[PDB]
Amino acid sequence: PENITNTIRSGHSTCVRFNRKGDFLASGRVDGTVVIWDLETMGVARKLRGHSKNITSLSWSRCGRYLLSACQGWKVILWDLQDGKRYREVRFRAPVYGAELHPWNHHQFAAALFEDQPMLVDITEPVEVRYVLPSVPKRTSTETDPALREKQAKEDAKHMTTAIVYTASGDHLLAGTTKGRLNIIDARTREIIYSEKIASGIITTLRLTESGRELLVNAQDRIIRTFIVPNLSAADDPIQLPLEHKFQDVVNRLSWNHVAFSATGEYVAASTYNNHELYIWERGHGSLVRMLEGPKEEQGVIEWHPHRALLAACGLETGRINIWSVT
C-alpha cells in the first residue's frame, strides 16, 4: 500500500531540501523564488525572492538559521532565515550546478558551474573572496613535449566538475566530473590528492550519509553507486574508494534522474528519467524494496526527511511536491 501523506504546491518546484532538525522544508521554483514550509502546519512560513531563474540547489546551515540557494541565472545567495534577509550574495559567470555550505561554517561554500571552473568562496564578509578549485591534477612542466602541449591541454580541459560536496569534517571536497571521475580535494591546499574513474558518463549527483562514511553517486551510465569513504580527516597518506553497491535496472535500461539517502542511510531512492516511478533499494544487501507509482507524472528531485521515513519528490510536469510515508 502506497501512502502519500501530503501534496503541497507553491509555484513549480525544481528542488527541495529539509533542514537538519526536520521541522522545515525549503523549496526552490522555476521562477527563482525560494519557499520555506513549516512542516507542522504544512503551510508557507516565508517566501524569498532573490533569484529570477530556476533554483538548482539548496543547502542548510548546521544550525538551521542560514540557507544557501543557487540558480541557473548564475547566482548564489545566503539567506538569514532569522529575518528573511539576503545575508550574502555571489554572482558567477555561468549557471550553478549546485552550491554546498561548509558543514561547520556558513561563511564558506563550494560550487560547481556549467562549463566553468568549480569555486570555493569565502563569504565571511560582504565582498567575497573566491578561490578557483582544480578539475584535474597539475601536470609537471617537463612531462610533455612542447609540440604535444596544446593538444594535451585541450584534452585535460574536457574534464569539468559537475558536482561537489564537503566531507563531514569540512577538510576535503569530493567532486564529480564530466569524465566520470571522483576527485578528492584538500580544502586548505585546494589541490587534488586522489582521483579515480568510478563511472562511464557525467557524474550528476553526489551525496554523503550523515556520518560522512558512505557516498552515493548518480552518473549518466544508468548505474547508481555507493562507496565506502576513506579515512581522510585523520592525522595519518595517499587511499581507496571501494564500491559498496551498484543499483540499476538492466532489462528496462532505465536512467536515473535524482537520488537520495534515507535518514539513517538504510535506503537509496531514485526518480526515473522518462517514467513515473520512484525506486527504493536497501543498502544492507543492495536489493530493491519498493517501486512507487504515486501519481502519473515524471518525478525530478527527491529528498528524504532527516529523522522519519518520509520521501518527498518534485513532479517535473506539475511542480507539485508529494511526500510518501515509506514502510
Could you give the strand order of the β-sheet that contains 256-261, starting from the edge strand earlier in sequence?
256-261, 267-272, 278-282, 288-292
Q: Which residues constitute the domain of residue 84?
A: 1-327
CA separation for the pair 116, 53 (Å, rounded): 18
172-177 and 33-38 strand pairing: unpaired
Q: How many domains does the chain have?
A: 1
Provide the 8-state DSSP code for 294: -
Could you give the strand order of the β-sheet that contains 172-177, starting from the edge strand earlier in sequence?
161-166, 172-177, 181-186, 192-197
CA separation for the pair 319, 12 (Å, rounded): 4
Read out DSSP for 217-244?
EEETTS-EEEEEPP--SS--------EE
Structural contact between residues 94 and 121, judged by C-beta atoms closer than 8 angstroms: no
Which residue bears the cell 520521501? Answer: 311
Q: Can you say how many angstroms the Cα of residue 246 is from the centroid of all Cα atoms in its chain? A: 19
Residue type, 83: D
Provide the 8-state DSSP code for 319: -
Task: Report phi then psi at 152, rounded to 5.
Answer: -60, -45
Q: Environment class of residue 46 by beta-carbon count within 10 Å: exposed (0-12), middle (13-18) or buried (19+)?
A: middle
**Contacts (Cβ under 8 Å, ≥6 apart) of 327:** 3, 309
Residue type, 137: P
DSSP three-state, residue 153? helix
Q: Environment class of residue 23 by beta-carbon count within 10 Å: exposed (0-12), middle (13-18) or buried (19+)?
A: middle
Q: Choose among 314, 316, 324, 322: nearest CA to 290.
A: 324
Distances (CA, A) of 43 to 36, 187, 318: 9, 39, 19
Structural contact between residues 74 and 92, judged by C-beta atoms closer than 8 angstroms: yes
CA separation for the pair 327, 315 (Å, rounded): 22
Tell me how long the chain is.
Answer: 327
CA separation for the pair 3, 6 (Å, rounded): 9
Q: How large is the C-alpha radius of gyration of the chain?
A: 19
CA separation for the pair 180, 197 (Å, rounded): 6
Which residue bears the cell 518534485? Answer: 314
Could you give the strand order of the β-sheet that contains 13-18, starting from the edge strand earlier in sequence?
13-18, 24-29, 33-38, 43-49
**DSSP-H helix ranges across the chain:** 146-156
